[PDB]
Amino acid sequence: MINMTRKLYYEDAYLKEAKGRVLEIRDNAILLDQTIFYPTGGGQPHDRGTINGVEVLDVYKDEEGNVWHVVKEPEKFKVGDEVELKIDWDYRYKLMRIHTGLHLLEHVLNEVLGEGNWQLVGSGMSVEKGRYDIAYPENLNKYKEQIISLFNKYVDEGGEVKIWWEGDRRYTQIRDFEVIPCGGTHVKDIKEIGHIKKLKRSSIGRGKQRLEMWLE
């Protein structure tokens, strides 16, 4: 079935610039059939950049999961032909390190707090920091330092972050750690993440704690 806008970022291979035919249009929407521009959802913001040197402001998906690229100059595009794609690599790559960071934080937390003794409740990330909302009885702070040293240690050692599909479902995994059902864009190796720049703990309420992490 090709009625689904083929995606390239899932195959990323870190490809920065892309080129693919063009499909229908809306007010600002620009349905396509090729793209390196990651839509949204899963806590990983829509990376950005330029499509034909044009300004991309929003990038999401439709019910059938069709990537629409909300641009600034919609009055410079037809309705069928072909175009070039350019994405803010850095803003992208610095998101992968972050997103891949969170998965590692998941394992690390398992090791330190004990797999089972805590519950992930919320997630998501900004362009600079990442957030992991959790539900754990003890005031996390008493683990700040043990967590960071462990996060980093794994980093240095590095490890392959393999990814795959099992039909219409995509799974990911770091080394021999947790196998996660995430749907974002990850680095190929965690050594490509970097040590923690800062790990702030805060109480979000209802007894839920929030780990915000920053990378060097």
H-assigned helices in the chain: 89-109, 144-157
Cβ neighbors of 17 (< 8 A, separation 6 or more) are 36, 84, 85, 86, 87
Q: How far is the CB of 99 from Zn ion (least distance, A)?
A: 6
* Segment 34 to 63, residues that bind Zn ion, using CB under 5 A: none
Classify residue 167 as left (phi > 0), alpha (psi -120 to 50) or beta: left
Q: How far is the CB of 58 from Zn ion (least distance, A)?
A: 21
Under the binding rule (CB under 5 A), the answer on residue 182 touching Zn ion is yes
Whether residue 195 is annotated as binding a ligand: the answer is no
Contact segment (CB under 5 A) with Zn ion among 4-12, 162-170, 181-189, 195-203 equals 181-189
Contact segment (CB under 5 A) with Zn ion among 9-17, 52-60, 177-185, 194-202 equals 177-185
Residue (56 or 182) nearer to Zn ion, CB: 182
DSSP 112: I
Whether residue 99 is annotated as binding a ligand: the answer is yes
C-beta nearest to Zn ion: residue: 182
Q: What CA–CA distance (Å, rounded) separates 120 from 82?
A: 43
Q: What CA–CA distance (Å, rounded) separates 116 from 105?
A: 15
Contact segment (CB under 5 A) with Zn ion among 15-23, 58-66, 124-132, 179-187 equals 179-187
Residue (47 or 71) nearer to Zn ion, CB: 47
| Pick from 92, 72, 79, 68: nearest CA to 17 | 92
Asked whether the beta carbons of 14 and 25 are under 8 A apart, the reply is no
Q: How far is the CB of 40 from Zn ion (least distance, A)?
A: 13
Binding mask 126-165 for Zn ion (x = CB under 5 A): ----------------------------------------
Whether residue 182 is annotated as binding a ligand: the answer is yes
Cβ neighbors of 24 (< 8 A, separation 6 or more) are 31, 79
Within 10 Å of residue 139's Cβ, how many Cβ atoms?
10
| Residues that bind Zn ion in the complex, under the rule CB under 5 A | 182
* Binding-site annotation, residues for Zn(2+): 99, 103, 182
* Binding-site annotation, residues: 99, 103, 182
